[PDB]
Amino acid sequence: SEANYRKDFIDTMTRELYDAFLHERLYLIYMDSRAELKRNSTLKKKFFEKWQAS
Amino acid sequence: QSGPLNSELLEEQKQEIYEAFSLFDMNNDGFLDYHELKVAMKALGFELPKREILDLIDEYDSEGRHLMKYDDFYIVMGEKILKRDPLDEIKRAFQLFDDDHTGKISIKNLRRVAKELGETLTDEELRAMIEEFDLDGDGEINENEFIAICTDS
Amino acid sequence: AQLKSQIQQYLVESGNYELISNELKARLLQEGWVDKVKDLTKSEMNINESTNFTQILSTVEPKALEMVSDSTRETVLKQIREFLEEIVDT
């Protein structure tokens, strides 16, 4: 009972810590992903416009 | 050094710098922390090691805040943009047009890029962009034909 | 409530935050999840009017989480649990 309360707190906090770690990792990968797409878009734009005006 | 840089940057290059900073200025406060700066530079095609990023912040850190101001980011990235290898740029752009990897930019590809950039163009005038620069007569544009377009400047 | 702050503050100073974080990332890389998040982000940008950093994240997030393998989830959960066990008084 005292041991039940300890377990439930640990189970609840394990789940919470995991959801945060995972969210932080998704956030970081996402940032990178946006950085890559931004760069790609910029290149397409530059050389598409250069082409069209050629 | 403001002035000597933005006379030799193209307007599209100045937008690129501004847009890359804004994207990761979550604060909208004109400052970026370390991870934000890292990705902002990556948005411009620059991969720096930890040591150089830290030293860049420390160099320009007018306020001990460990952040980087938009105006300093503009100066540092402006110089690096100017030192880009134009030929390496053209080649990456090529792989990006040829997104099905046939080794040639077809009308399918070019029309897809146009639609991505929100560019509103006739089918007939997309054909003309190829027709006007197709040195093979093969109806499509290979890396060389494309490098030739972009190198004319 | 506030014991959590004490545990989360001990988490970082022990270096156990970084151990767990690094294990999570190694395993996410190993199972392909980094490429999946990237595809999800790229795909969601064509389907959308918006460039908004936060908006696109909120569409990508639910879908990305479901693609995490049971094996990675269980192994990291187990690792966090064992650390909590060793810390929360008797």
Residue numbers in the entry:
A (entry chain B): 752 to 805
B (entry chain A): 9 to 161
C (entry chain C): 6 to 95
What's the paper's own text on this?
The yeast Sac3:Cdc31:Sus1:Thp1 (TREX-2) complex facilitates the repositioning and association of actively transcribing genes with nuclear pores (NPCs)—“gene gating”—that is central to integrating transcription, processing, and mRNA nuclear export.
Crystals were obtained of Sac3 residues 723–805 and 753–805 complexed with both Cdc31 and Sus1. The crystals obtained with Sac3723–805 had a pseudotranslation in which one half of the asymmetric unit was shifted by close to half the unit cell, which makes structure solution more difficult because this effect greatly reduces the intensity of half of the reflections and so reduces the amount of data available. Three different crystal forms of Sac3753–805 complexed with full-length Cdc31 and Sus1 were obtained by vapor diffusion. The Sac3:Cdc31 interaction interface involved primarily the C-terminal domain (EF hands III and IV, residues 95–158) of Cdc31, with fewer contacts observed between Sac3 and the N-terminal domain of Cdc31 than were seen with the Sfi1:Cdc31 interaction (Li et al., 2006). Sac3 Trp802 appeared to be central to the interaction and becomes buried in a hydrophobic cavity in the Cdc31 C-terminal domain formed by the side chains of Phe105, Met137, Ile138, Phe141, Ile149, and Ile157. The Sus1 fold was based on five α helices (helix α1 residues 8–19; helix α2 residues 21–36; helix α3 residues 38–49; helix α4 residues 58–70; and helix α5 residues 75–92), separated by flexible regions of varying size, that were arranged into an antiparallel hairpin structure that curved around the Sac3 helix.
